Write a protein that binds this ligand. Structure first.
Ligand SMILES: CC1=C[C@H](OC[C@@H]2C(=O)O[C@@H]3c4ccccc4C[C@H]23)OC1=O
Ligand SMILES: [Cl-]
Ligand SMILES: [Cl-]
Length: 268
């Protein structure tokens, strides 16, 4: 019963399956503007990450999900029970990295990864600009732990971006507050604590790096970092738009970019 655990939804028709993973704060409905454009040529599988508001909180193994590997094996188990191989993995934020790690362990399950707002490490290092100094992110988490609803009412507009009181601004706010707070904090400890830079050379399946030109959470430098350190074919396309969830806040300009990168491969 894994399909129930992650609310796996399956539809469309085709020879190769497109898998859709979401990021923190939302769930699979994040892809409302993408699903209809694929179902005429592909099977489409959607799944929620464990911890999302639509999942049973009794299933959030805190020890297992204390690291990205826990979610990576969830994705492998999902793909296995639905008989998915050589899939096209389209992942936003978290799921993109979960997908990338999974493709290292089980390259038989992935043909390519299309990723949006991907981040291999939240904080700045030497040789790496990820947005915020580690010292300061630690305060952003610690204050979120001290006063959860207050500072996430803050956080949510900064992440969605754009005009206040929009569909994406109200949708993300709704799904974000549907998470149980202790689960949300564990997920945040996991994300703010991971560092995938040494893993990137082990990802050798082709990676399409798509990201916003004005994302508070992922600077443009992060995409050129990914493009330079991935172990296989890769490519970068910027989207002239603001926000962390372009696929939801600006579908007219983001969806055709995703489609082209889903449809088309990478030339030598
Ligand atoms: C899955 C995903 C990753 C990327 O966020 C990372 C994180 C998030 O947004 O606040 C989380 C948080 C919590 C405390 C400190 C920093 C961060 C940044 C974290 O954006 C996403 O959707
Ligand atoms: Cl536990
Ligand atoms: Cl186009």
């Amino acid at each position: 019963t894994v399909g129930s655990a992650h609310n796996v939804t399956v539809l469309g028709s085709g020879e190769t399956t497109v898998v859709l993973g979401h990021g923190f704060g939302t769930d699979q409905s994040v892809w409302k503007y993408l699903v209809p454009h694929l179902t005429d040529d592909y099977r489409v599988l959607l799944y929620d990450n464990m911890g999302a508001g639509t999942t049973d909180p009794n299933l959030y193994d805190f020890e297992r999900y204390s690291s990205l590997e826990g979610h990576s094996q969830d994705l492998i188990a999902i793909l296995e029970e639905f008989h998915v191989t050589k899939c096209i993995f389209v992942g936003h934020a978290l799921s993109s990295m979960v997908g990338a790690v999974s493709s290292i362990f089980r390259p038989d399950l992935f043909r390519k990864i299309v990723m949006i707002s991907a981040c291999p490490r939240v904080a700045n290092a030497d040789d790496y600009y990820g947005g915020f100094e580690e010292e300061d992110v630690n305060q952003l988490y610690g204050a979120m732990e001290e006063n959860f609803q207050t500072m996430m009412t803050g956080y949510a507009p900064i992440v969605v971006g754009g005009d206040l009181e929009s569909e994406a601004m109200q949708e993300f706010s709704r799904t974000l507050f549907n998470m149980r707070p202790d689960i949300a904090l564990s997920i945040c400890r996991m994300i703010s604590g991971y560092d995938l830079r040494p893993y990137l050379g082990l990802v050798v399946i082709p990676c399409h790096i798509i990201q916003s030109s004005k994302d508070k959470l992922v600077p443009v430098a992060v995409a050129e970092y990914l493009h330079r350190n991935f172990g296989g074919k890769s490519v970068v396309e910027l989207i002239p738009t603001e926000g962390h969830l372009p696929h939801l806040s600006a579908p007219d300009i983001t969806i055709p970019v995703l489609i082209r990168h889903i449809n088309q491969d990478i030339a030598d």
